[PDB]
Amino acid sequence: KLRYLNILKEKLGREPTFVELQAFSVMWSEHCGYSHTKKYIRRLPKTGVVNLDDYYSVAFKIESANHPSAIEPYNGAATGVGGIIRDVLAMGARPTAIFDSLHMSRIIDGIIEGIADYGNSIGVPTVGGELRISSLYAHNPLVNVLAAGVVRNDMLVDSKASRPGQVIVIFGGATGRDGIVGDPFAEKMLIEAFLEMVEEGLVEGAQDLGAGGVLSATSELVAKGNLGAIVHLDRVPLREPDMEPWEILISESQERMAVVTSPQKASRILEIARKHLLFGDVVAEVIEEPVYRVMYRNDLVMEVPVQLLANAPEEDIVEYTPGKIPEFKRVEFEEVNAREVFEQYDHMVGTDTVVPPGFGAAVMRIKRDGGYSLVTHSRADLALQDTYWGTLIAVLESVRKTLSVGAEPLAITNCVNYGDPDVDPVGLSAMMTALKNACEFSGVPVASGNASLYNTYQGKPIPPTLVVGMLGKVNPQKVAKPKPSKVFAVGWNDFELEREKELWRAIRKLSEEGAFILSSSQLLTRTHVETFREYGLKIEVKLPEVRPAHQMVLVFSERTPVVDVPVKEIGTLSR
Ligand SMILES: Nc1ncnc2c1ncn2[C@@H]1O[C@H](COP(=O)(O)OP(=O)(O)CP(=O)(O)O)[C@@H](O)[C@H]1O
Ligand SMILES: [Mg+2]
Ligand SMILES: [Mg+2]
């Protein structure tokens, strides 16, 4: 913030006001700023609402609740959920499935329950997830939450102001002195509320309220529209009435959404909200002038170029060149049979999928012959040994899982979980390049993502962990389910980037022929066995010895697979 303060000062041509420093403290903070990752992200291929069938689109995104969680496992995680759901809800999509990618040194119930309760409380199933246990995350639990929803392409909500005159409504829970705990009940009302507003063609644009609260929502909603905004802090319904404009402006009270609309629609927006027991008012006004004038009645609180707020100081970036794929070695993440713990908290117990998520990619259908896959994958264990390849391979194995389910990879929502970038700007680059190159190799673009840097315990950084939330397309009727069959190991014990595509081609043919397929580092895990039992199936196999980063999958079929990849009957699935 030292360099920044200067910069902010040079840009202000003067000395920052309390509110100014207060505001830019948020907007430029790495969390809302992305100073170390912005340029790395602009480099990634893109497209977070991915179309699905020219009629439906799935809005999905991943988010981390790291620091919060490290403090308040329960609240942190839950808050991350709440927030990520709004990000999706704001896209005008009805949140249909939560996914989490937990990375901890142990089974921290707080996080599991926090995630679980919230989702249940708002009625959004916690379909799938991922759980990685490593002492290496002792003081830095990586709580990544991904959410997905469905949205008719003709109901897609623009995520920004796009016309002077439009006004921004802030509704949902009230604003109080928070971050300057939220309930799913208000969140659920928020979803029902916002969704109703969408259904009525009232929401012309929107943005959820999280980091930066009212400041980030408004400044961004318009900044994204290359417009301005006159924000009236006094119009924000508060919980604590004595709050100061700056408190009202940067407050991060939860369960709050900003709705861009036409003055004429604001009324219903408020009616719809209120009848849903939420509070809201027309807080801002989208103006053509690119200024961000925060007001509290006729009191000018703050006025700055919206764009200055929007664009934080961008750190340079170093080009990273990757070397020979390492001969990865044992970096054990003691797998926990924490299936009893999830049961106790009703977590990831989402039985409403085309096929149990415990088999890899969670499949959801939006129609009889239509549906989408979703997977959250990461290879921290590998990324620890080599940031690039590990990170890259994590993307490739996600493509496998997606393929293994018969789903064609559509997009990637991803979360960068890194330590201090100023110290190790390399790992950050390696991580981003791997992803960049990974998307380029796979051809799968990046729809959106989250970045969490400075994850370190007294010097030590958390393992470079890029969680990959991969969206895939799939016809449910064409999704293979477990059945007594022969189990074959298909692929290789080791990894050679290039031949990855021949493995995919293979997964594709087999999957196409209806074969069942698992793509796991362990080939088969307790969950896989667990889940098979749910089908009343016994998995007896001579699991091939495999490398950490390998290119082998488990194919279950009657007939022996016939592909251009090593095939070996390794056992059977029966009874
Ligand atoms: N690794 C990544 N890849 C692609 N896009 C990324 C990214 N990291 C961040 N982004 C994008 O940059 C912006 C910020 O992501 P972030 O998750 O912090 O958003 P947010 O506005 O929802 C704030 P909050 O945490 O308060 O909910 C988004 O528009 C997101 O799509
Ligand atoms: Mg932000
Ligand atoms: Mg947000």
UniProtKB/Swiss-Prot annotation:
Active-site residue list: 31, 65 (proton acceptor)
Binding, Mg(2+) 2: 87, 208
InterPro entries: PRibForGlyAmidine_synth_PurL (IPR010074), PurL_C (IPR031652), PurL_C_sf (IPR038411), PurL_linker (IPR041609), PurM-like_C_dom (IPR010918), PurM-like_C_sf (IPR036676), PurM-like_N (IPR016188), PurM-like_N_sf (IPR036921)
Sites where the protein binds ATP 1: 34, 61, 414, 449
Enzyme class: ligase
Binding site for ATP 2: 100, 129-132, 360, 401, 521, 528
Residues noted as binding Mg(2+) 1 in the record, renumbered to the chain: 63, 450
Effect in UniProt of substituting residue 31 to Q: Loss of FGAM synthase activity
Keyword Nucleotidyltransferase tagged: no
Subunit structure: Monomer. Part of the FGAM synthase complex composed of 1 PurL, 1 PurQ and 2 PurS subunits.
Additional record remark: Purl possesses an auxiliary ATP Binding region which is not catalytic, but able to bind additional ATP. The conformational changes associated with its binding could have a regulatory role in formation of the PurLSQ complex.
Family, as annotated: Belongs to the FGAMS family.
Protein name per the record: Phosphoribosylformylglycinamidine synthase subunit PurL
Organism from which the protein derives: Thermotoga maritima (strain ATCC 43589 / DSM 3109 / JCM 10099 / NBRC 100826 / MSB8)
